[PDB]
């Protein structure tokens, strides 16, 4: 019966760490095969660049 | 030799000036562009650009 201000809110803090270390948790990409000796634009494990 | 090294120091410092955040949250442009939405990323981009 309590008011809105006193209801229980379930809370979850999702503390990532975005950093150098080898990533272990990330999104569902297709992860295609590479190409070599011809310059491409990669999303090479989140280090997107050409 | 002195003018050669003095010019080289100028160029080397110019290059090394990239690493600085200038108050942004990152230094490499693709990452600040790759983990922030446009309306939020634009201000960080502007600080780094200036």
Swiss-Prot record, chain A:
Mutagenesis / variant outcome for changing residue 2 to Y: Increased binding affinity to human ACE2
Effect on the protein of changing residue 20 to P: Increased resistance to human covalescent sera neutralization
Highest taxon listed in the record's lineage: Viruses
Effect of residue 2 to T: In strain: 19B/501T
Segments of this protein annotated with the region Disordered: 20-42
Subunit structure: Binds to host ACE2. RBD also interacts with the N-linked glycan on 'Asn-90' of ACE2. Cleavage of S generates a polybasic C-terminal sequence on S1 that binds to host Neuropilin-1 (NRP1) and Neuropilin-2 (NRP2) receptors. Interacts with host integrin alpha-5/beta-1 (ITGA5:ITGB1) and with ACE2 in complex with integrin alpha-5/beta-1 (ITGA5:ITGB1). May interact via cytoplasmic c-terminus with M protein. May interact (via N-terminus) with host bilirubin and biliverdin, thereby preventing antibody binding to the SARS-CoV-2 spike NTD via an allosteric mechanism.
Function: Attaches the virion to the cell membrane by interacting with host receptor, initiating the infection. The major receptor is host ACE2. When S2/S2' has been cleaved, binding to the receptor triggers direct fusion at the cell membrane. When S2/S2' has not been cleaved, binding to the receptor results in internalization of the virus by endocytosis using host TFRC and GRM2 and leading to fusion of the virion membrane with the host endosomal membrane. Alternatively, may use NRP1/NRP2 and integrin as entry receptors.
Descriptive protein name: Spike protein S1
Originating species: Severe acute respiratory syndrome coronavirus 2
Organism classification: Viruses, Riboviria, Orthornavirae, Pisuviricota, Pisoniviricetes
Encoding gene (name): S
Portion of the full sequence shown: 500 to 549 of 1273
């Amino acid at each position: 019966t309590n008011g809105v201000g006193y209801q229980p809110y379930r809370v979850v803090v999702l503390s990532f760490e975005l950093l150098h270390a080898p990533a272990t948790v990330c999104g569902p990409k297709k992860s295609t095969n590479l190409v070599k000796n011809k310059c491409v634009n990669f999303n090479f494990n989140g280090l997107t660049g050409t | 030799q002195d003018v050669v090294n003095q010019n080289a120091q100028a160029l080397n410092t110019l290059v090394k000036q990239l690493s600085s955040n200038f108050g942004a949250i990152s230094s490499v442009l693709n990452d600040i562009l790759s983990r922030l939405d446009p309306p939020e990323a634009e201000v960080q981009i502007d600080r780094l650009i200036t």
